[model samples]
Target: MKVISLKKDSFNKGGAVITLLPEDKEDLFTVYQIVDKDDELIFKKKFDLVKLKIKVISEDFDMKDEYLKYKGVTVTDESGASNVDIPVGKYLSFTLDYVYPFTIIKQNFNKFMQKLLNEACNIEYKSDTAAVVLQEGIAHVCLVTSSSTILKQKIEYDVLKFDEKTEKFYKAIYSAMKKDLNFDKLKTIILCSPGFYAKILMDKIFQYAEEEHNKKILDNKGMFFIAHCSTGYLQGINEVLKNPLYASKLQDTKYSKEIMVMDEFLLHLNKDDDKAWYGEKEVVKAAEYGAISYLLLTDKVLHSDNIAQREEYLKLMDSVESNGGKALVLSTLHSLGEELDQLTGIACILKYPLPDLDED
Candidate 1:
């Protein structure tokens, strides 16, 4: 996604209308989160190749078709542009199915929303990272990027039955790593596991490199860092991403910051300090009393398949944000998002302890 322009509304209490260009599928989710039903959307209509603006009455996003369809009344002008039939106050529909510069006129925009745009704009970072989350028999190789995470390969060997032996498993992982990982694009290679499994994998990589005389792997030995996690799965990837050891190397990017927030939420929750609360019912109750300080929600919660539920959550975020609180929607594709999804898909760090809140 590309932020084409930004126009802040000094009159609207820190709100802004941001113009954006959607470049990939991941961008569709961010666009859905920031835009509301009342926000006016302006874009160059595809059919007649004319520009049009409309107040969004309702919106539907289809991931299958890669489209963000909005149904609303025209709010542009009395006389349409280029003799088009788009008249003011008339109902119209538009689809963001292509890569075009479009504008979202927002009134309740907050810093959390703006932070998302800033992260989207700063997708071009200096380094790319590759990580292998391994256990006894299997390893998941992943490529972590500025905006998205890609599973490069999943290497598994029949170590349970010892069909090929553990040595063969390491060789298989090393071969897949050599084949799928790009050293030029990847500056950090993280090998993480529950115990010593990841350590063994790292040893094998260098041993294989030495046997094969592969300078690409041997020369960049400093790039490889072995860490520890619970299991060799998506959840393991989540734990590794949240670990403080890699924060310096990851440069405390937007992704790491998400884990930081999750960790903070966990800290408050574990302490039973009343500063943090989970579950939709409990958090919304805290929100109603203007207690929310940092609201954390998964993209699954924001972009729910149920329309009524989705709108309610969006409005809840907006209202909680009105109290000068931060509302963050974490990506379900990432590690933090997956963990957040397991916790009722909603939670918040409240401004003060509200221990009497009802649990959902």
Candidate 2:
């Protein structure tokens, strides 16, 4: 789970909101949609962040934080006031005793969930030598960095102290990325640097890989560059953007250039120029009936709350849902899906054309 700031512009005029619930840690980013008072999805976007699993425990039970005052078997309580039995791996919210009920804290749920989830999934490490791990499922992908001319034990990077920390960090990143020797199987290679080298950029590494290794590493199908400030242990979020296979997942998202597909489609409705333009409210009802086919949302539009045409928006979502289609909300943070975040609004892919918004 991740902590995400909400955007209001992605909602339908009738009443619906959608936004990405950016992951604080972990992989598998997720998106969340907010409907109206009726719990309908008024707005939503596919969240691209991190994800991690957590285990809740209480002191009385065999865990660190006990929920109830039972015997050897501590009663796991989601709320201390009431000792309700819970599963071993149940998600729990850490609450204060007497000062507040666990449920009350849960009411303000988003903040708490994001906070703990972030802690649970936070990725941290500094290494002069490391290995990249890729699997088909959980660890589906990995890319190792190549050797560099810089030595790990020399140089300094302290803001005030002039120690050899700088060399250590550079060597750490290079080592960590190149730990395992199976680079022959890597489909893509990404090199990241903060441009501290004055003229040389991280792209040089990719070039070297192709030239020296005789491998068409990043020609078209695979290969990219990542620019980071320091070589210290940083989150791998930037890497996800560099990899083509992973980045393509959010191409139609609010973060990608294709975001205009939905808004451009909506423009036709406003001008009463397209036969497929459908009323915003009507489209929402269609979505409620499971009529929507493809849902494309921009992270930027969803982040703001300045929508002008709402009813048209909700109806668009309805149409997509009514048609038994899926919704694809973009993260909009990277280059792949940044343009979809037009200020106009979120969009839905319909099984058929929608009625123009200006229709009489």
Candidate 3:
């Protein structure tokens, strides 16, 4: 979700009209977080394959499709609502587009909503890690977003003549990188394989970029990082993220930090240490006792409309900081945070074993 412009609504408390451009499916998830039932959205896009863009009032987040989609209705034009031959009170369900910008009209865009907007717009923490994992006969290209890994392309050549297949395979993979990657916000591009083939891909990517005059790729030449992994598939990404040598190169990525913390939290739990606690009640209890050594929470805990509950969680993290502990707010966009959410989206690693943590 990219906030193009935000204007505070006149005569309404905490209200505003926010224009946003959703950069990916993850952006739509953020939209789901902020825009609830009865909210209004104004956008221009092909409606019903008819090419009409109109404002629609949000229904509920329809999850039957496995992605964030808005099911809404258009208001009557008698009240000055924009209409494109679609009558008011019509039921509409639509998916947001990456290229088109939409306007969210809120009666009260509260503090939490504003925070979400600011967080989404922060380029420094956005999904900027792109990787191309390669090996004999296979090349897997992916955009490692803060929340989930998106497979952009999987190029494979099984020709017995390995020499001839190499050139075409490299070209296809590099072409996918050029076509799919959002280079403007991308900070790091990992080109890794188990062998020397990674160097070939890097050279060809740059070589093609030069021939095509794609100056953006040329300017960000140093962003290209070559590494080694076990396979040319998704599992290879796991190895790449774990490799400590890429730490400095990938410091800008929120994905790695989430994986590392989640791994540590799991280690504490698997070791049978009483120091690991999850769930809101238990987490806060640890914080209150100044026993929390580290805290992990998803954005869901902080995005609530309920002010008191949101404040309580904030204070819990504050307590962690003052107690010589660190707190991390995990992203809902990544697998780490999604699983942490299973523990109520709030958890903590205590400073020491507290055998009776559940006791009243």
Candidate 4:
């Protein structure tokens, strides 16, 4: 994903314009975002070749795809036209211009913009991460990347005498790590297995590196981290992420920020009950009173299929921001966000305790 250009028309009106080039089909989503503000409008059409135009709402207000022109009510094609997918590998150009009292457009635009940036960052970061899951005589080495995980090698050692079995297993792992694994590109290597297998694998890796004089592997000793997982497969990567040791390292990213905020919200829910609120009615009331200090929302609500439900939450988001509160959108890709969605897709930390208005 390349940002071909970014231009802000005016800061006073909280307006900006961005031109993006989609490197893949998934990048088309950056243009599909629903602009919620009245003054803010999105202009894009999907076809063999897609064209997008976004601007501050004006009298002209005329935009259309092959199906229909601009109408706020329809979520999908009202004209009964079949969906046309946007092809990847094309210049996707769009502009966002905002008016006064419409800063949420800027915020939402940045959120979508951050999605693109995160994709690029994922490519950079994931390229440097290698995950190996192993136990006993079985092992699998996978290269984790932003787009997909590639299995580099699989080793299955034969059973033998106890002494020979241990030696064979160690040698197989050492051979795979040295020959197949791209140690030069990897900055972080997560070794995971149930029980003490990961611990033993780390020792073997280091020992082999020392014996073979593999400076590349030895030099990256600091990159190796061990965690416990149930299996030596792709699923282990999820377990590895949930492990406290490696999870802490991922805490600096945006995804982690959402988790941290939810953790704080949960703590308040348990200990400082009056300061935390969840559910649509509770949160809406709190926002109406400008009592919310931090609004925590999930993507499920923002992308709900029900138009009224989506609009209602969008209004709450706008209200919270306009009242000088902060809003965080939780992605369901992580456990915390999934937990948040199960709890009604809305939660908040209040500016002050509203114990008098407390109603579960």
Per-candidate Cα lDDT values, in order, are 0.76, 0.33, 0.73, 0.61
- TM-score for each model: 0.50, 0.29, 0.56, 0.40
In terms of lDDT, which candidate is stronger, 1 or 4? 1
lDDT of 1 by residue, 128-243 (tens): 57888898778888877644566878877622333457888889888888788767555577788887888878888988999999998886776777778888885776677787
lDDT computed for candidate 3: 0.73
Backbone clash numbers for all candidates listed: 0, 87, 2, 1
Off by over 4 Å in 1: 78-85, 125-296, 299-345, 348-356
- Tens-place lDDT per residue, model 2, 73-120, is 122445532322334333333211222111111111232224333433
* Number of the predicted model whose lDDT against the real structure is largest: 1
Best by TM-score: 3
Model 1 reaches what TM-score against the true structure? Answer: 0.50
The true-versus-predicted C-alpha distance at residue 24 of model 4, in Å, is 10
User: In candidate 3, what residue range of length 10 has the lowest lDDT sum?
Assistant: 47-56
lDDT (Cα, tens digit) per residue for candidate 4, span 1-49: 4554555545433245444444433333323343333323334443342
The 10-residue segment of model 2 with minimum total lDDT is 100-109
- Candidate 2 lDDT (Cα, whole model)? 0.33
TM-score-better candidate, 2 vs 4: 4
